[PDB]
Amino acid sequence: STGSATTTPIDSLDDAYITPVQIGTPAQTLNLDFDTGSSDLWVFSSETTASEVDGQTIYTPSKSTTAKLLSGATWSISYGDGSSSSGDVYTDTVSVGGLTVTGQAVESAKKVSSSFTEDSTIDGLLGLAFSTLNTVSPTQQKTFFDNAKASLDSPVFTADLGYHAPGTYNFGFIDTTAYTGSITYTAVSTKQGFWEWTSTGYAVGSGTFKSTSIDGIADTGTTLLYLPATVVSAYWAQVSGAKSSSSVGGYVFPCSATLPSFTFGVGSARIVIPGDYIDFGPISTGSSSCFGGIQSSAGIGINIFGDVALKAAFVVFNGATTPTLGFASK
Template identity: 50%
Template sequence: MLSPLPDLNIGSASAIPQANDVEYLTPVQIGTPPQTVMLDFDTGSSDLWVFTTQTPQQQSQGHQLYNPDSSSTASQVANAEFQIQYGDGSGASGTVFRDVVTVGGVSVQDQAVEGATMVTGSFTEDQATSGLLGLAMDSINQVTDGGTTPNPQKTFFSNAMGNLAMPLFTANLKQGTTGNYNFGFVDESEFTGSVNFVAVNSSQGFWQFAASGFAVGQGAATALPHQAIADTGTTLMLMPDEAVEAYYQQIPSAQNSQQQGGVVFNCNDTIPSFTAVISGYQAVVPGDIIKFAPVTGDSTETSELCFGGIQSNSGLGFAIYGDIFLKAQFTVFDGGNMRIGFAAKSDGNF
């Protein structure tokens, strides 16, 4: 399983954290000659969209832009448009091009590149990013013909998969430092022990899997069967209320803050680990990672209050295992076998 075939594509690209690890950005080359933009790789959506020279200036100021007119391999797709809205209410819409896209040395010809003609305010404010690169299933791509008939486009990974040495990619996100996404191979130096695989249910278009329970700190595991998705594009770990309440009962100062929109606690409290039980594997998220971000100061060391990295999924039909979880695990997205694998980081290297 871990031996790539010779003479086929592999690639590796950096995943660079932004402030408080709110997102991870990866350099992507689009067009001929290549134009480099920084994109947020998102295993919870399936659209590759970018700020372009056609994005209104008041929305795109300060962003690195893709200019299709400067690419000899770019072509606009007639009648095609996209409109996407994410779970936090942000979104983008616009037109569709085809162009060559390269990630970490792996290239795809005629990749659908969606050019934003409208983005919501949070994307405008986030000047470090030039858009998203979706890595979920093709079925939830948001391209339509003329705004009515769905015309889902293949993701970068879907297009690349057949030419990769192994039909998978891996995520090794790190806390406060640069990690990586690897395509077509599994780097055994990035994890310890074995990779623990569980089947993926792709019916809703996500990297969705079954989890069986959880544990807090050194406590015994509690059975809580639930569906979950592995989502690099979500910052936090969003869990069923039963797990959230059980976790924060172990932090005396924890309180639900309407002002902050979630559970906060005293930064100098002892923060226990959280363990997700997945097909018998115990995926441990250290308390230091769950101490997500300062509320009242510049850092979790100087702030009185910290915002918790585990929050309620607000009754959503599945949990979202976002970056808080994925920072603590080496993760294999195996598209060829429709499964996902988790392993402990080498030397606790979060």
Template identity: 50%
Template sequence: MRFSVVACLIAAATASPLTPNSRNTKLQGRAFSIAQVTNAKFDNTETGLDARLYAYIKYNAVLPETLQVALQIGEHVNARYKSLMGRGMNKTRGQTGQVLAFPPRNLDIQYVVPVQIGQPQQTVFLNLDTGSGDLWTFSSETPQSQVQNQVLYSPDASDTSELQEGQSWNIRYGDGSGASGIVYTDRVSLGVTSFDAQAVESATRVSGAFTRDSFSSGILGLGFGRGNTVAPSQVKTYVENILPSLASPLFTSNLLAGRPGNYNFGYISPREHQGEIAYTNVSRQNAYWEISVDGVQVGRQGTFRPAADQLERVVVDTGTTLILVPDELVSEYYAEVRGARFAASWGGFVFPCASAMPDWYFGIGTYRGRVPGEYIRYNQVNDTHCFGGIQSSEGIGFNLFGATLLKAQLAVFDYVDVEGRETPRVGFANKRLLRFD
């Protein structure tokens, strides 16, 4: 299901929004929530194979043999992907952090937020993505042939826009698609916050994958500025710029299955999780919200399996859909699902839709984050079989926790740890799951 977003502003001092152990809280700081609402025009045509391929495209990763075979023999494969056959993708595996966003997809959830740019204000609708460090938008400088009803940002209509001479940006994806352009600074507002000199990347070229999505005008990256594609001088993200004005330097994602969720900035709502929040530090040298995970467990009565060596690199990404982990962990899960098998034409594990699905748990210290089995019943591939929400990460270079997991967890993206050092961390907490519990 696809969602747009409307801003629901929450005063920092109301409803005791900050958790008791919140630190470095500014009582006069800003805090606000952005709630998702359903896009009634959504047309769900994407498959599980599409969702897995998008992850490889996004991170410019090497296509494993299983996906190459699926591209060759799968009659259901979107024609767009046929260009990937035999190319193997870019051998950089995305580890430089230069490919941080990706063409909008159709399946499940797309996060769009109304953002005000310029003076007087112009409202554009941008995708939220923790796997991106860019803020870019269709603009009056985008060729008309590449625009399809997107809302456009017009730098010339803003009294506060300033062209950044010599600065440019260029996002390229593994399938050859991309976007590029020039850079302005301008006043940008989100919720109750604003920043007067935010870098706004104006698109002067976009590929057809973006043009076809008239619902979105671009990306608002929630990743780190060190992964920003602006050159020769990288810029900070919007969230990095507004951190000093927030009541607490963090944001949370509270995604839900089958209904609207929300993002909170500057506070953690105690109503959105159960029990304590388990934190683990991110890798400072990385462009993403990348963490390590200690192990996994299959089923409520299963035995916890230490797997820190296999899950040393896990990127928490609201902009991808599936849980992608090493082959061994994938096989161990589907060994507990009746009738599950690897389907070459789908490039992943499928199973009878009527099969009972065990819960899947990941561990950080003593914490066990639960993903209900029903959430892993991703979507149907035919009248009898379904595609699984846990699949292989082979060839990407790291693992991914996407929306399949994030719908079951409150995720906290925290820029400063409890001692006040500037070491970002990610927190997870279980929550009451509205759809299946």
């Protein structure tokens, strides 16, 4: 089997991407944030504290004839941006783009933090990291991809995120019309539960490529590109007037600037992020200071190839017995 679903930016800055997901019988369609950096499929629900729901579409398990409460199971997660959610667990039928899994753990939120409440466009998350990170207790649950994998034509999914435009998540096949050139595959470590890999280096604009190993994670659930402070300083030094602002929490730059591209290495291959992908707009409405899309990972403890990097590529998440990651230009 295969599935294919369109993923759409939630706003004009590509702050996140939502993909429609059918849950239950009859289907309840929710728009979920597909997140290769986490491993829980959780949703706003009829159980979510009412004051914490502000415009999201909710899953109502009592209206799904295939929903079953998973006895005694709870979940609780916190993300690197400080956000969090928790609740109970159902199993139900979940379909993405025509691909159906029965008995998928659907984690129903009883509580969500304010940043989730304040984002009316995201109805929950669909985790696509390794199932070892799933938070359900006392019996850990499998991701949607892990449950689908054996049925897929090939044990893979691909991310093709758009810049200011829709894109696609495919499951079970590689669309050879969706990229240019070849796909370069690179080794993955699953030891931390992530799609963790090592980039071979970087260049800023038309500058010389610096060969240097950069270990990091392919994370569709993180908006920005988080890299070592030395790399990020080298990037922003090429933007007149850019500076790291402690009050804002990262590098900002004059909105009148034209940003240079940023290239990262995948083996001998090179993925070029156009400068415009790095502009995240005014720091507050009407400001002429703009937020940068490449930021230091120093406070985080891991480098993160988030949407800013991934949307410049066609990305293969190969879930074969030894997982690998593939990147192509597009």
